[PDB]
Structure formats: structure tokens, C-alpha cells
Amino acid sequence: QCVNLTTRTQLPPAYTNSFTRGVYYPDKVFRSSVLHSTQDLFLPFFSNVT
Amino acid sequence: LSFELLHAPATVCGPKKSTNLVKNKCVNFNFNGLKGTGVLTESNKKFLPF
Numbered sequence: 001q002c003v004n005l006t007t008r009t010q011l012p013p014a015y016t017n018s019f020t021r022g023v024y025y026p027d028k029v030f031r032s033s034v035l036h037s038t039q040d041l042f043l044p045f046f047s048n049v050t
Numbered sequence: 051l052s053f054e055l056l057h058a059p060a061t062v063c064g065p066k067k068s069t070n071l072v073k074n075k076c077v078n079f080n081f082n083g084l085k086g087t088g089v090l091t092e093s094n095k096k097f098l099p100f
């Protein structure tokens with residue numbers, strides 16, 4: 001059974017900042033002491049996270 | 051036995067050719083569909099599992 005519930009309470013969520021997080025390895029290659037420029041879907045630095 | 055071939059990744063291939071690996075010879079190589087030519091030598095590089 002799926003029992004109905006309409007007593008949901010709306011509570012305003014907090015807002016905070018993702019300072020230097022949201023980075024991942026974009027592929028499966030090996031590099032050593034190299035600066036590399038990539039274009040992809042990333043989380044912008046100092047963003048607005050819930 | 052029946053085979054279904056649709057717009058799918060088709061992970062079932064089956065038989066394939068195997069070969070022993072040679073070293074210190076300028077040779078043609080094919081690693082997982084990656085084609086190339088050159089001489090292969092032991093490597094001391096530390097990769098990652100992925």
C-alpha cells in the first residue's frame with residue numbers, strides 16, 4: 001500500500017558555499033607534472049549550494 | 051540459438067584472436083582496439099586502477 005500524506009512542512013533550506021570542491025578525473029590517461037586545460041561540466045568555484 | 055542485434059551497445063562479441071607478447075622489437079601492436087607501431091619495454095610508471 002501507498003499511504004497518502006498531505007501534512008508536509010515547508011522548511012526553508014540553508015544556502016552555503018562550495019569553495020574548492022567539485023573536481024574529478026575527466027578521463028583514464030596518465031600524466032606526470034603537467035598543466036592541462038580541459039573543457040567539461042564542472043562545479044564553479046565559490047558557488048551557491050543548497 | 052537466435053541472435054538479436056538492435057540499437058544497443060552489444061556487449062556480447064565472443065570469439066577473438068589471442069597472441070603472445072614480444073619485447074625489445076619494433077613491432078605492430080593493438081591494445082583493446084588501440085593501434086600503433088613501435089618497440090615496447092618494461093615500464094616503471096605507477097598508474098591508477100582506472
Ligand SMILES: *[C@@H]1O[C@H](CO)[C@@H](O)[C@H](O)[C@H]1NC(C)=O
Nearest residue numbers: 015016017018046047048049
Ligand atoms: C545564494 O542565493 C541566494 C538567493 O537565492 C542569495 O540570497 C545568497 O546571498 C547567495 N549566496 C551567495 C551569493 O553566496
